[PDB]
Amino acid sequence: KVPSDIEIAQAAKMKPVMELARGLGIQEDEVELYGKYKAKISLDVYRRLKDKPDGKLILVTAITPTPAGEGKTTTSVGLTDALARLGKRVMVCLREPSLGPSFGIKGGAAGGGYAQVVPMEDINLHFTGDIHAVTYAHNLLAAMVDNHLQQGNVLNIDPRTITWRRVIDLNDRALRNIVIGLGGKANGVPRETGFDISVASEVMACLCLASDLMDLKERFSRIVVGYTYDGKPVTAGDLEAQGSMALLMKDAIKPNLVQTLENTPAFIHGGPFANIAHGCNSIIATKTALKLADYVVTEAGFGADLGAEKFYDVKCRYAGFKPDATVIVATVRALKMHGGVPKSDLATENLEALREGFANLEKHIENIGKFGVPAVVAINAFPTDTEAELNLLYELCAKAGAEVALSEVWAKGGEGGLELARKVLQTLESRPSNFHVLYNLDLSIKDKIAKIATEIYGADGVNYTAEADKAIQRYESLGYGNLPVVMAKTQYSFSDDMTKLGRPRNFTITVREVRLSAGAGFIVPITGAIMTMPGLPKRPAACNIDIDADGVITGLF
Amino acid sequence: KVPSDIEIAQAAKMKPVMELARGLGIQEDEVELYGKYKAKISLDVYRRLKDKPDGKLILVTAITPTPAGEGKTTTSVGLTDALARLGKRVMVCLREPSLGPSFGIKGGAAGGGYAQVVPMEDINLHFTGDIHAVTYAHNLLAAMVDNHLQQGNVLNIDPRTITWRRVIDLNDRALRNIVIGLGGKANGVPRETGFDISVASEVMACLCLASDLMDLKERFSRIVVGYTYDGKPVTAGDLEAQGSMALLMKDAIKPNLVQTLENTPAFIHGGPFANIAHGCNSIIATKTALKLADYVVTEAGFGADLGAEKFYDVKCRYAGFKPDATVIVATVRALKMHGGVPKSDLATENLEALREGFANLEKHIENIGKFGVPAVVAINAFPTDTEAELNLLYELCAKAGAEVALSEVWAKGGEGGLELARKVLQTLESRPSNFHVLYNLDLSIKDKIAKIATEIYGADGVNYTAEADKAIQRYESLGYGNLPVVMAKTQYSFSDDMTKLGRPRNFTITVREVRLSAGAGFIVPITGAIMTMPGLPKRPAACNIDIDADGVITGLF
C-alpha cells in the first residue's frame, strides 16, 4: 500500500485522555478537558508526588542536521511505543510546533509514519492555545513599554535602546523591521522595532524553564526591556508587568496530555528556538513525566552540538535533573551528505562516503560521554539503505565504543524500535550515569564560551568583534556575568561556517554579537545572522489549504 | 450589603455544562468541553432542528449611555434568570468581551452583582480562543497581502491603497500608525499601515454575521484588502486566503455554552464593535438558542439609536428573525444627566431635570415602535432614587405608551426581575410584534443614511465631505450600493456631537468618511473620528494585577 502521515493520523483510535490520566494515577480533578482527546494537567500532580521516585530520564538527540532530514522525533516516539510494548510505564515529552509554518511550507506530523502523537491537526494549529498565551504576555509587555513612554517616560528610558520586540506566530517578513508610534502626540512615541515569530519569545523560553507559575512570574519581572538614557537597565520588574503576564499564562503553564498512535501517554509542552534558546520541551512536562513514569523519553532541537549540550547545561542544570541514558539519531543518507555526497546522489549507495561522514556522529558520541552520560546509538532505516552500508556503520560504533541498534518505526510502529528499546534498559541496569555540567557558573563569560566551543564543537579558539567585547564588558559589569550560555550559531556545522560538514578541524569560532536573556536567565552569543522571523515562500500552503462542507481538510499536510 | 462583583462570581455554584446541554436536548457527541463549565456546541444541533419553530426573541437595549452608567447586561442576565424562575425555557446570548480592557480600565463582570454569566475569569481572558482564532485568521491575510507584494506583485496592487490593517487584542496606541516592510529588498515592501483591536476586525464582524463555516468562508473571499494601480479592487478571494482563514476558524464557528449565576444556560459568541460594526453576538449562537428554548434574551451594543437599530436592520435582516419584544434599560441618574444635571449632583432629587431627560427615553421608545416591536422599559433601581423620582418615571413611561418595571436584579438576582419578566410575558401574550426593517436595500447609500439619521437620530439632514462623496460614488459604481449601512458615530448623543445630551433638535449629521466591509456585507459611514484601537490610561490596571502561589488573583477587578 501507500498511506500518508495525515491518514495514519485520522484513521487511528485515540483513547480519551481522561482514562489514560487514570492509567497514570492522575485524579479526575487534576485533568481539564479540551474535547475528549486533549487535556491540561494541573501543577499538583508534581506538587503532591513531590518526593516519589523520579523514574529514569532518556534524552533523544541527533547528529548534525542535513538537507536529507533525519526525523529526530519519530525515532523518539516509536521508541516510547517499544518501551510500553515491553509493558513499561513510559511517557514521551515533545515540543508544541509553531502555527505559522502550516501555512508556509506545510505542517508535519508530531514524529511520523507510525510513531506519531495525536490528534495531529490540533497540535499544528491552536492546540490548547499555549502559544497565544505567550504571544499576549510578550505583547502586553511591549504595549506596557510604549504606554510608559507615552505617559511621560517616568523611568527615563531611551526608546532607541529598547530591545523588547513584538511577537506573532505567522511567517511574516514584512514585520521584521518596522517603525511604530507615529501620528503625533496622541499616538505614542516614534521608534524602530519589529516582530519575531512567537516561538522565539523570551516568554516562550521562560515557560520552558520555569519550575512553577510563581517562578514564571518572577523570571518575567527580571526581563530587560532596554536602558535609560543614563544606561541603567530597565526591567519588566520596573514596569510592574509580571503580575499581568503570569495571569495571561495561568493555563499555558499546565502541560498538555495527548497520545501516541498506540495510545502511549504523551506530553506536549513549550517549544522554543534551539539557537537563541535551548530547543527543549518544558521543565514542567518532563518533571511531571518523572514522578509519573519510571521511563521518560524526551528531546532537544537541532544537532547534539546545540540541543543536547543546552539540554544538559541549562535545562538539567536549572532543574537538578540527572539524565540517565541518551539516544543519538542518525541516518546513513545523512552521513553520506556529511561525506560530501549531494542529495540526488544518495539514490545510490556510497560505502566509501559513509566512512567519511561518520566522524560527525563519533564527535557527537564523544561529547555525550563528556557529561558523564551513557551514550547509545540508533539508526533510522529507509528503502535505499543497503545492508553493506548499515553494517559498515554498525561496526564503527562499537569501534567507537557505545551501544547501537536499528529502528524502523516510520514503518513498523513501536516494533521496529523494539530492538533499540531493550538496549536502553540494557544500558540502564548495566550502565549508570555520572552526570556533571560541562562548565561552572562562576567562570566569567569568555571562559564559558571557550569551554563550550573548544571541547564540544571541536574548535581551536573563539574570537570577538568590537561590540562583542563592548556588550560582554557591559554585562559582567551589570552583574549578569554568572549566567549560563546559549550558543546562537548555525546548526548544519560544528563550526559557525555552515558549509563546513563532517567533523571540521583547525577552524575557530567568531562571536559577532552578544545578547542577554535575563528572564530566561541566560546569555546568548551570536555567530551568524539569526532568522527570528521566517517568511512565506513564493507558492505557500495557505493558497491551497481548503476545508469543505464536511470538515475535510485538503492541503494542510 | 452586597459583595463585590468578582467574589460573587467565584462562590457561585456552577453545574457541569454537559448537564445543561443534555437538559436542552443537545447530544453529548455535539459537545466539546473546555473544563467542566464551558463547551463549544456543534453547528449540527441547529441543522437537525432547522424545522422546529423559533422560541420568542427578546432584545435588550438601553437609552443614550452617559458617564453615570445604565447596566444593560445586568438586566439581560437578570431578565433571563427571572424567566427561568417563572418556569420558562429560556437562554441568554451575549458577546465575548475584548481581552485588552481587562488591563487598562479593568475587566468587569458579564453583567454585575447577582446578574452574571460565569465562569467570570475565563470569559474576560482567553475564554475558548475565539478572539485568538479571529486575530490569526485576520493577520494571515495581512501576511499574505504582504507576501504577495514581496513575490513579484502579480495582482498589481498599489500598496499605498491597502485598507486591510492588522489586529491585536490589547489597547496599544503606538500600533495605530506604523510603517512596515523595511530593511531592504529581502524584507518585504515598505508601506504605511497599523493595528486595530481584534474585536474591531472585519473577521470578527463576519463571524457574527455568518450562517456557518461555509458561509463564513464565502464572506472571507469577498473581503477587499486594497486596489490595483488601475483602481480595480483586490479581494481575499483573489489572494486565495479563504480556505486558510476558514481553517483557522474551524473551532471558532461554534457557540460557547456557559451559565448565569443561577445556572440558566447562556451562549457567549462573537463580539464586534458597535459603531463600525453592528455590536451584536453571532447569528449562529442566537439562531441555535431559538431552537433549544422557548424564549431567548439577547442584547445589543451602545444605545438603542445604534445597537437596536443594527440588531434589526442587519442581524435580523440576514437571519430572517422577527423580534417579539424589546426591553429598554434606563436609570433615574442617566436621565437626569440628560436633563442637564452634572455627574456630581446626580444624587440630589430633581423631578424637573428628570422630566427634561425623559425625552431621551421617550425618543427611544418611539424608535422601537418604528420597527413594529412592542417596548418594555426596565428601570435599574439605584439606592439614591427617591419615590417621587421613580413614580414620576412610571407615569412618564405609561404616558408615553410603554409598560415599565423596576428592576433590582443587580441586588437580588432573578427575584429582582420577576415583575419585569411578568411585564414582558404580558406584552408577549397580548401585543404580538409586526417586525420590518427601517429601510429597503434598494435605496441609495445616501437615502439609507438619511432615513436612519432622520427617523432614528431626529436629525434634520445629512452632510457629506468631498472625500465621503467620492467614496460613495466609487462604492456605488463598484456595485456595493445595495448594501446595509452601519453608522459609526458617537454613542453619547442622538447627534454626531457627544456634548449634546437628551433629545437634541435642529442639528445635522456630517459624514466625513465612508468605508466598506464587503465580507460582512455592509457600508460604514463615519461621523466623528472613530477610535478602532484605544490606548492604555495614565496608570494601567495592569500595574496592580497579580496572582499569588494559591492562585489568588488581586488587582484585576
Ligand SMILES: Nc1nc(=O)c2nc(CNc3ccc(C(=O)N[C@@H](CCC(=O)O)C(=O)O)cc3)cnc2[nH]1
Ligand atoms: N452599580 C450599581 N448598580 C446598581 O443597580 C446598584 N444597586 C444598589 C442597591 N439597589 C437599590 C435599588 C433601588 C432602590 C429603590 O429605589 N428603592 C425603592 C423602590 C421603589 C419602587 O418600588 O418603585 C424603595 O421603595 O425602597 C434601593 C436600592 C446598590 N449599588 C448599586 N450599584
